Design a protein around this motif. Structure first.
Motif, short mmCIF file in Angstrom:
data_model
loop_
_atom_site.label_atom_id
_atom_site.label_comp_id
_atom_site.label_asym_id
_atom_site.label_seq_id
_atom_site.Cartn_x
_atom_site.Cartn_y
_atom_site.Cartn_z
N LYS A 14 0.82 -1.62 -0.23
CA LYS A 14 -0.15 -0.19 -0.28
C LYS A 14 0.68 1.25 -0.42
N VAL A 15 2.07 1.61 0.42
CA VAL A 15 3.32 2.37 0.99
C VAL A 15 3.17 2.47 -0.59
N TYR A 16 3.74 1.52 -1.15
CA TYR A 16 4.72 1.55 -1.98
C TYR A 16 3.24 2.25 -3.89
N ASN A 35 0.83 3.76 -3.05
CA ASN A 35 1.07 5.68 -2.06
C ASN A 35 2.16 6.59 -3.05
N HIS A 36 2.91 5.86 -2.93
CA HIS A 36 4.28 6.75 -3.71
C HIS A 36 4.52 6.75 -4.85
N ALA A 37 3.49 5.96 -6.09
CA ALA A 37 3.46 6.07 -7.29
C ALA A 37 1.98 6.61 -7.32
N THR A 97 12.81 3.58 5.65
CA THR A 97 12.66 3.74 7.33
C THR A 97 11.30 3.47 7.19
N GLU A 98 10.70 4.44 6.39
CA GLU A 98 8.70 4.60 6.45
C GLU A 98 7.94 2.87 6.88
N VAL A 99 9.35 1.95 5.39
CA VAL A 99 8.62 0.59 5.49
C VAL A 99 9.09 -0.16 6.52
ZN LIG Z 1 4.73 6.91 2.56
#
Ligand SMILES: [Zn+2]
Ligand SMILES: [Zn+2]
Ligand SMILES: [Zn+2]
Ligand SMILES: [Zn+2]
Ligand SMILES: [Zn+2]
Ligand SMILES: [Zn+2]
Ligand SMILES: [Zn+2]
Ligand SMILES: [Zn+2]
Ligand SMILES: [Zn+2]
Ligand SMILES: [Zn+2]
Ligand SMILES: [Zn+2]
Ligand SMILES: [Zn+2]
Lengths: 70, 68, 68, 70
Positions: B43-45, B47-49, C63-65
């Motif tokens: 989900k973070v990836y 988000n960053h995309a 760091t975030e992950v």
């Molecule tokens: Zn983030």
């Protein structure tokens, strides 16, 4: 790819909603369902090895815990 | 129920003829834990995309970074 | 030696007037472990971006992950 | 940003070479040096809290281990 049984890609979708990460692309859900099924077979296999190493024939939750540690 | 059956089939296919009933529960819990862990990172990836839907590449990277 | 001094200064600044000598060693080991852990993940991100040098964004995501 | 002492950005570079990840951008090394220094202060602070909770005045490796667990 995988022989034997595997968790459905549909089940990955339900899990995704339960944690609020949104929708999954079909290829993403299929990959995850496949990956988790591969992991499940490894966990069960190692657990059965622990069981047998101990000369038992019935898999126990303890065998599963040991397997999850490895 | 659907997933419990798959787990029971995996146990049989891997020649585990007898097991404590709770093993299935444990494995369903693992399934949930594993999938949520991978998806949480994916989900973070996404988000960053700047994407709304988690894609194959997100799952692949999450899996790769959290071992393989 | 340079880093050992920084650690000794941090101990003093945080009012830890006395400590077993090996605490410094432990903290240097932690420093190495933490930095290597973050860099190891950051390298993957740099790779997937087709970069030769790890950048701020790579370190930030790693760091975030791996918590925050 | 940070008050007190902190690990140098240069030290991050040495660590990067020792593990084979290649060169780091200056901003990446500075961020990491800052982040690890913040972590170090937290570890030492918690360790000192454990030490004091135990009524001791000399920080031990055991206090550091406890802190690393938290
Ligand atoms: Zn983030
Ligand atoms: Zn995969
Ligand atoms: Zn077998
Ligand atoms: Zn039992
Ligand atoms: Zn896709
Ligand atoms: Zn993508
Ligand atoms: Zn890769
Ligand atoms: Zn930069
Ligand atoms: Zn970048
Ligand atoms: Zn940072
Ligand atoms: Zn204090
Ligand atoms: Zn001691």
């Amino acid at each position: 790819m995988l022989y034997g049984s595997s968790i459905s890609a549909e089940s990955m979708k339900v899990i995704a909603e339960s944690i609020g990460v949104g929708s999954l692309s079909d290829d993403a859900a299929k990959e995850l369902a496949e990956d988790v099924s591969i992991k499940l077979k490894r966990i069960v296999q190692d657990a059965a090895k622990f069981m047998n190493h101990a000369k038992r024939q019935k898999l126990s939750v303890r065998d599963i815990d040991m397997s999850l540690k490895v | 129920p659907k997933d419990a059956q798959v787990i029971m089939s995996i146990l049989k296919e891997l020649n585990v003829q007898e097991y404590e009933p709770r093993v299935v529960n444990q494995l369903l819990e693992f399934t949930f834990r594993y999938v949520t862990s991978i998806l949480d990172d994916a989900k973070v990836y996404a988000n960053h995309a700047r994407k709304k839907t988690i894609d194959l590449d997100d799952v692949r990277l999450a899996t790769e970074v959290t071992l393989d």
